[PDB]
Amino acid sequence: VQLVESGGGLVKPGGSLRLSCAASGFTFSSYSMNWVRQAPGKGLEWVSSISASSSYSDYADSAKGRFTISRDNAKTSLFLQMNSLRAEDTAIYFCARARATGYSSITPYFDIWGQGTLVTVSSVVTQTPSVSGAPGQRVTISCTGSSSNIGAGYDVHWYQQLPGTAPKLLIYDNNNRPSGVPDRFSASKSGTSASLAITGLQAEDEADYYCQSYDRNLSGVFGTGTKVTVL
Amino acid sequence: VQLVESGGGLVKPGGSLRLSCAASGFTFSSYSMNWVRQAPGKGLEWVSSISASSSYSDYADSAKGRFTISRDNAKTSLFLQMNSLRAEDTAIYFCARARATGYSSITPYFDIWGQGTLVTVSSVVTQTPSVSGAPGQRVTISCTGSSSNIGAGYDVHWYQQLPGTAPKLLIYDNNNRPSGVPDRFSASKSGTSASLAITGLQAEDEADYYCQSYDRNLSGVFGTGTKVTVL
Amino acid sequence: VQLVESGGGLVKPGGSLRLSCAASGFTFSSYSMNWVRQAPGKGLEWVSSISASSSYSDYADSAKGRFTISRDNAKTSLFLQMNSLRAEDTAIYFCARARATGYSSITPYFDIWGQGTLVTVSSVVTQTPSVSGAPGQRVTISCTGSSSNIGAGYDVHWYQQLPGTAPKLLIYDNNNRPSGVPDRFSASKSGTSASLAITGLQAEDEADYYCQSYDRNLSGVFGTGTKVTVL
Amino acid sequence: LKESYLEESCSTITEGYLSVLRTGWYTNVFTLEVGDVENLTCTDGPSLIKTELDLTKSALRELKTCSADQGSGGSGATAAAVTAGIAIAKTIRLESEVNAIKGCLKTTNECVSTLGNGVRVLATAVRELKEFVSKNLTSAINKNKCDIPDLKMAVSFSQFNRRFLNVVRQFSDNAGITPAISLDLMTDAELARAVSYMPTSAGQIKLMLENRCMVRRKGFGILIGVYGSSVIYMVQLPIFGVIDTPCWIIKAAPSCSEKDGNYACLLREDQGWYCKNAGSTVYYPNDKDCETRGDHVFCDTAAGINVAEQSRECNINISTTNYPCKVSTGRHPISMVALSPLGALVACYKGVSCSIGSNRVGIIKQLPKGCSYITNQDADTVTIDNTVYQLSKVEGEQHVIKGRPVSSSFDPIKFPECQFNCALDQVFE
Amino acid sequence: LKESYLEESCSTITEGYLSVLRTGWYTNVFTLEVGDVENLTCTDGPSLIKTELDLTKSALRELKTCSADQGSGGSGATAAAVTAGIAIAKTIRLESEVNAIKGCLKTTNECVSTLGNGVRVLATAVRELKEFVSKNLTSAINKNKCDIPDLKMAVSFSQFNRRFLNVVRQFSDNAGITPAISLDLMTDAELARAVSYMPTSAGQIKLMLENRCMVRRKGFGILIGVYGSSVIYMVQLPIFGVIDTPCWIIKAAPSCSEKDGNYACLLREDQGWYCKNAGSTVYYPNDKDCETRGDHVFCDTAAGINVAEQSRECNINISTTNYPCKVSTGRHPISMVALSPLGALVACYKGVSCSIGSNRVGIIKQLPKGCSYITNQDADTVTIDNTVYQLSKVEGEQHVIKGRPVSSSFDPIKFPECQFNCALDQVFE
Amino acid sequence: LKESYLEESCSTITEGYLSVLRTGWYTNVFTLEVGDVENLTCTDGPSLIKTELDLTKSALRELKTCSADQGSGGSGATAAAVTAGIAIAKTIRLESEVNAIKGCLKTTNECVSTLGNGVRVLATAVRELKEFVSKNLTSAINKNKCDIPDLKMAVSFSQFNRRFLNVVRQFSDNAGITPAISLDLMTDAELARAVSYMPTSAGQIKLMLENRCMVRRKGFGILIGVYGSSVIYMVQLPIFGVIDTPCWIIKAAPSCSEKDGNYACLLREDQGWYCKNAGSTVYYPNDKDCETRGDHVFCDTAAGINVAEQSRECNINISTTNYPCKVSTGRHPISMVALSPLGALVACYKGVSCSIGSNRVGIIKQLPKGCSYITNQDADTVTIDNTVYQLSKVEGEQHVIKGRPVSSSFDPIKFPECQFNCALDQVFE
Ligand SMILES: *[C@@H]1O[C@H](CO)[C@@H](O)[C@H](O)[C@H]1NC(C)=O
Ligand SMILES: *[C@@H]1O[C@H](CO)[C@@H](O)[C@H](O)[C@H]1NC(C)=O
Ligand SMILES: *[C@@H]1O[C@H](CO)[C@@H](O)[C@H](O)[C@H]1NC(C)=O
């Protein structure tokens, strides 16, 4: 399974750009792809979505009309058109597959991410800015937010992103865990909040942890970014 | 599949006569049977009917009371008793197996006709008196009916009768066609009038063509009889 | 299939006595059970009931609270504890199975009886006091009841008890008959009274006959007991 | 009626019925006009009208989403009937057809209209609520005050909109395709008028005027939808083409032969109704396809399965039959009572108590091992172990076709043991 | 309750239930008297009474043809119940019985009448609409003018005739045989009085008084017909002769053994309910025959299939069983979850993701290939690929009968493949 | 839509549908407050209020007996849905949760409450009858005299208590678990508000607001019970987690080869709907689980059966397939018409008359022996013997996968006669 990307070249401030994402290894016609924007040094941002057959396609309030999305199931490709680029669009773009359990709420989680492509020009949830410590003792990360983010019943997912690496799904559907992730990490949701507990930290297992939960006003918020460092 | 009708002879006026159909070759207890008389030199006229199991029996308005009909499924026979018959009953009587598709309307069509026996004693649908023309080209025969004739939704059936011959089902259920009839014949119905076309009239196609749909007041009304001929 | 009885020992008035009945030969956990006491010289009397799982238990309206009944399905045993028995409780006690057809009315009949144990200290249906006659002819026994026992729709059963012998079911469910009973016995229930007819009685028919029905007030009423004699 | 107990296969065949086979559909398009209820508004408190106006608005808004869209198809009678109805429903959905129907129904209460498809339908207008709403409901609600103190219009509106609310409830519960014609879609007067307007013979008219309670069950209704203020929906009355032809019901029980505790039994799978439309036996496997009302049996030709006339050999001699007769064989049988229309055939095996008796004699006799036929004259009650069955009280001609059971001659020790689908002629030779 | 997971055949047997088996019927003949509505006529416009009088007349004329005629028979519980009801319905249809019932009900509201068939029935008169029609309606409509301005009569008639209209609707929709006792045929007071009048023991009376909505669903109503002005219909309440006897429900999942990509699986057909009427196990295959209300399970003895007492060996050792135990075998199995009353048994094979997890800990663990039993205490949610099942919240005693799966020892490479109703002691030797 | 006629196995596969798969439940707990009707009493005769008060009391006392209690379990979609609903119902039944819900609903008409189980529910109070009972009714019935001559209260109480009576009727008829959300449990406004309050994306909200008539059928209602004077019941709205993924329906007819008067045919048992939740084909065997509304097909994931992606080979080449296709081989076939969503495939054999024809041209042509596919563009009516089928009027892309029938090349002389669970790759090698 891989989502190769192309089309991320230098653009003048006000041109047009095509981003293509070719997915190999799964049925492209049954998964609702998404696009995620990551600024050079800031948190992840959700920009656009697409249904499994292009019937529905939501956009972020900062990219409505300005951007557009499409897909071709015959060639298994996903395309993003950016017109009239601004000065705040310099970032790396990931094409991410999405799945939704839907048992309690529809809060899609991006389990598989692309490598990302550079793009350059010439009620949001928030969490702890950083946390430190030593290997051994447990550390906790809290992702707050209420009303529509988590007070509406939407689940909370946690992604771990190493520096200069594609984000990886760490916790999905509140407190569950995917295969390949050690039981070292734990997660929980209480009221309108979230908690990720890491006990027995490794020196090499420090990265940025982001919380994502669907929001009624604007779809797919992301956390501000918790910087975990180990002495 | 044929009928060997017998039992018709000259009688004194005001007497009685017993006519019999002896149907052999099919399930006589499942097919409804009808009696249809033809005056010498004029068109066919419906006389009587009987249900599949001799439950519902219908008679023509002129033949009501005087005529009665019965059937015996043990030896597969049909009987008509005529009491106090008048002078106008000099006619050839035909047995008729009746079938009804019943998809849009219930109009029984007589596909299997008996040879017929001659009795000597001593709101109808009308059509063209006669249609004549050279061989090879096409002619049209139109049969019009009142509101209760064709305007009630009753399908129109067309029979062709050679001189001195039992009539045969030419077209049943508006525009359909039975096996053994060439695709030369083709009919249609519109609103209150039906019509067939002899597409490619031949020398042997000259006969008498009769139309019959049904009536709410009468029953099984037959056409006035068109006399087609070839030059 | 049989019901061993035990525990019928001498007891002073006002004491306690435990009677045990062990049933062998059938599924003890699916049959309701009953206690029937017979005074030394009078007719049978109902005592107490117990269901197939000890959830419903009904008592005769003469010893409510005074007596108690229980059963254990582990070893297929049943127990009756009599506390502070009076001087009128001297009787032979029978543990009897219960079956109810339930097609028209629920009137259990006591098909299998135990031998019973003797206990000593230191709207009722009625029938003929006695009948007599000679061998060869027919005799009748009439058991009449009020509107609550037979006039309420409840069935009537007939038991035959030899002198010094456990009662045996003779007629069940109005007029039916079990296996092993000669067909010369007949029964019939009409309105409010039942009748048992014995045709051509032999010399071994000299035994008491009891009629049993069900009351709305006091369940499981028995007859007064008729005695037949043979010359 | 006349019931014959065939002992060769231990099965009862009951003849003497008369067919009523639904062959066609007749379309009665009702246009229930509601009126300008949407324009009317109430701002005061509950005045016995604002609540009912709100309920009417909710019903009208709900009817928009319950349009009977095209189904997924199928092979059963209900699927074919639904497809046939939707075939005319889509033609009606066109703007020209509905406009013409409403135009012709504006002046008169009945129309006989021919669609572009060529089919002829009867258009009925039931615009009684619309008239009241238009003139004398709105007369007192000129302003926004709905608290009229006369109180007569409140109960009048309650009486008038009951039919509309019932129609909305039925179409919402059934998703636009009701399973039967209720008393709310088409009243008795409209049903009689539609029957009188149908193109059918006098016999069928009399039969279904004496059996309205089955015509209301053999038909159904399809919702075209809400156009403007009018809820348009068609009712598909049945047209019984084949009528009064012989039918017979075949019921079967497991016939067994056993020795040394090992059994071998056959049960006829071909149980159910057989009829004759026109010289061709038609078999209805599902018991819900055919319903008996007296001696007549009402069936739908869509669910019928054509069966060759050679199948009559299954009721004469199956041991040496030429036509392949379907049997389901097996060991370790089942004790059960099959209640024939006249009598009942009981098949009880192993350690099962079996008896019959009347209501007066008592227990008449004990049934010997093996399946047996019991008429309703010589017995009144059948007891199997503890279960009690009451036989029918109808009268008829009972016959017993004496013979030897077939399974008694097929080596009960071991048998090929094919159950779901095999024929006795060349699978169990 | 107490559930045992039989690992040998991958099944769950849940005991601890208590039987309530319907053994008989009790007949309550209601005579809903309408009155002389036919004689009364209205010729003016809609006056809140003419419409309602027309509706009443339409209902009365519609009830004539929906007489519950004799059915076609059958073998199921509903067929036997219908036949038993019609057996008394035909006796009631005779003029003598109906005349006697009406005569005895003329003076009093209840009768206990014995028919010529020897059965005892309870005759109930609900003549409230007739009283209003005869006393009030006729007085106000002495003339043909139905536009009485009191408005009391209109609403009173609307209230009184609702029960009659509901009865008509039910009997017309159900063709004279309703599937269950509604709130319109027999109200709560009449149900309580009929239960108190039944010839049954105190325990059954108490149980039927506690569970009124299971007595309203095991019975049904049959329309005798419209005689004169009175609609007479019988209601068949159930009589539970067998009560408080042990029952157990058996559920099964396909147990599989596979190698080299080739599977071999067995699934037990003997799923469903088992009870004990009197020393004889009775097996109910259909889950609609038996309904659970607490620990009690209500069943109908008509649908019960008698099974030998040796069938209990199917839950001990099927590998060396003496009684033939039914199993359907196959290959390439189906992954599914069978929700037992206490826990749930999941059988997922091939490439299917399987897991259990609680609501506060997350995914607890993954399922090893093969069927597994999951109690409701150690897990709260079962995930199969994407489908999510929520387990029950009831408490009980869970046991596991440890052993070796049977299908693990029947040569998974190739197997005889007997599918429909094949035993295990002899078919798969 | 796009339908391909696979001639290899004589089947039709129709693609182009879009899935709407129910994945979860959303709980809306309604607390219908009735009031102190029990304390109020009437001693006089009927007054249009004593009858209605008696009816209300009867309904309230009837609801007490049948509280929807834990079922017996199962494996179908309905059993899983009932178990999931009762899981929250039992948590609600606790005194703490119900007290908290009623306390928060005392002041406001809406609550968003988190239970101790951790699930979030929407609490709705519909206390309109209680207001009238506690303010207007008790004011005029201070004494036991209920004959108030205003006539306003009688009709007002008739209007207000209709919803409560309908709820009682539904819950009593369905024994506490109604099969679908009616118009009485949850009105249009409450449905819209509950949809707007759901935790779901904009697309699902829009789809459920457009297809509002399917949300009322995919959900159901459970009765928590009568606490004090309030009837509390939960409604389980569906949550469509997986939406707008490709689906296709597969229909089959028996493909036959005949020689010397003996037939041999194969029929595919893998008929029904197939969908793709997330990279995993899900097959729904019963046609009642999945139902279509336009191009969208609504399904329940509980009834789905997971099928490996290798099953796509069953629609390409079954003669040399690797995945075992589920087909059954038998002789003496059945003549029938399977109505595909676009066209229809007819399989008539032996002496059966077969024809196709339009509504204008007449009988277009006869059918050669063997199964044939008929589009709805080149024909309008299919006649088999006497039965007439009307084809659909929808438009789509029809394709024919040309090839040789499989059963024509497997020696029609004899077959193993495998019928229930059989494969063509291995069983019929
Ligand atoms: C409204 O007015 C009409 C007069 O045309 C009358 O017939 C009708 O009964 C009135 N509606 C009422 C009083 O509800
Ligand atoms: C019916 O007549 C009686 C006669 O006493 C009267 O009391 C009553 O008010 C009238 N109306 C109703 C609805 O009972
Ligand atoms: C109920 O009482 C309120 C309070 O006065 C009143 O506004 C309302 O009209 C009453 N409802 C009736 C009488 O139906």
Structure overview:
It is classed as viral protein/immune system. Keywords: metapneumovirus, hmpv, F protein, antibody, MPE8, viral protein, VIRAL PROTEIN-IMMUNE SYSTEM complex. It forms a hexameric assembly. The entry is titled "cryo-EM structure of a structurally designed Human metapneumovirus F protein in complex with antibody MPE8". The complex is a heterohexamer, with three copies of chain A (231 residues) and three copies of chain D (429 residues). Helix content of chain A is 0%, strand content 35%. Chain A has 231 residues and is mainly β. Chain A folds into two domains: 2-119, Immunoglobulin-like, CATH 2.60.40.10; 123-221, Immunoglobulin-like, CATH 2.60.40. Chain D folds into two domains: 2-20 and 243-423, no CATH class; 24-239, Helix Hairpins (Orthogonal Bundle). Chain D is built from nine helices and 26 strands. In chain D, a hairpin with a 2-residue loop joins strand 23 and strand 24 (387-390). The longest helix of chain D is centred in the first third of the chain and has 17 residues, at 77-93. Classes of the chains: A mainly beta (231), D alpha+beta (429). At the E-F interface, helix 5, helix 9, strand 14, strand 18 and strand 24 of E face helix 1, helix 2, helix 5, helix 6 and strand 16 of F. The structure holds 2-acetamido-2-deoxy-beta-D-glucopyranose (3 copies). Residues 132, 136, 152-153, 156 of chain D line the site of one 2-acetamido-2-deoxy-beta-D-glucopyranose. One 2-acetamido-2-deoxy-beta-D-glucopyranose is lined by residues 135-136, 156 of chain E.
